[PDB]
Amino acid sequence: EDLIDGIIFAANYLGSTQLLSDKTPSKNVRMMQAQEAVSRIKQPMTEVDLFISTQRIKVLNADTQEPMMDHPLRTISYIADIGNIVVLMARRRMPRSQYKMICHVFESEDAQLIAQSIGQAFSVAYQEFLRAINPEDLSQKEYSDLLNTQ
Ligand SMILES: [Cl-]
């Protein structure tokens, strides 16, 4: 076989928004944060390399090759692409009972491939809960809802 364990994409990092809350943010709140982040795109940027594996997503400065963000895959709450834009949201570590959600925005010719690569690295892990129900017995609306709350 020719299994791929990691992939790196060039992209321009446009910046991020951060949301603090006293309870984990709902789906409706996360989608509001994602739209607001996109609506801010005018435009300063940093060239980055975006590394995706089954364990984590890391953003490296392209020029220095030093990490700027390192997110374990299990903390990603949302990934989407629209045109050349990629939006990636992650729950940041906070003391107990405080919550911080970060929404990063990138631009790349490979936006759709990047979002697809993240999405599938994720739902690979999430479906690894055969040892906790058989995903293949959940409808589309059931699995989709699992991903949006769990
Ligand atoms: Cl890794």
Side-chain angles (χ1 to χ4, degrees), residues 2 62 98:
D2 195 31
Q98 319 156 226

Side-chain angles (χ1 to χ4, degrees), residues 19-144:
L19 172 69
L20 278 182
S21 57
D22 49 5
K23 68 174 182 177
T24 199
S26 61
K27 176 178 165 277
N28 282 349
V29 162
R30 294 192 304 270
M31 296 310 95
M32 290 174 198
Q33 177 171 9
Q35 292 179 20
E36 156 66 13
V38 175
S39 76
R40 288 185 181 191
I41 295 164
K42 289 165 190 176
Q43 180 66 61
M45 58 189 63
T46 303
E47 296 181 334
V48 299
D49 292 318
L50 188 59
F51 165 76
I52 302 145
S53 68
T54 65
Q55 295 305 117
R56 74 184 52 174
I57 293 171
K58 283 192 265 203
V59 175
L60 309 182
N61 183 282
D63 174 49
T64 70
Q65 292 293 288
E66 295 296 323
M68 293 158 68
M69 294 96 75
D70 195 340
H71 295 297
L73 197 48
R74 65 177 167 75
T75 71
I76 303 305
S77 57
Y78 185 61
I79 173 68
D81 58 291
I82 170 65
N84 304 127
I85 299 307
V86 177
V87 168
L88 172 66
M89 297 179 64
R91 299 188 285 275
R92 299 191 63 193
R93 195 168 54 97
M94 290 294 290
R96 190 184 51 74
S97 303
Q98 319 156 226
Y99 301 85
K100 183 199 265 175
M101 180 72 73
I102 186 153
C103 176
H104 296 301
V105 178
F106 307 90
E107 181 193 31
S108 177
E109 184 167 1
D110 295 318
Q112 189 167 240
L113 269 175
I114 288 159
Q116 289 178 345
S117 289
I118 293 173
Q120 62 70 32
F122 188 99
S123 88
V124 146
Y126 185 68
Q127 293 173 356
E128 268 194 16
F129 71 169
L130 265 62
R131 196 199 58 212
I133 73 174
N134 184 13
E136 293 184 343
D137 294 316
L138 300 168
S139 61
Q140 284 192 33
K141 181 60 180 172
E142 282 181 317
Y143 185 74
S144 174

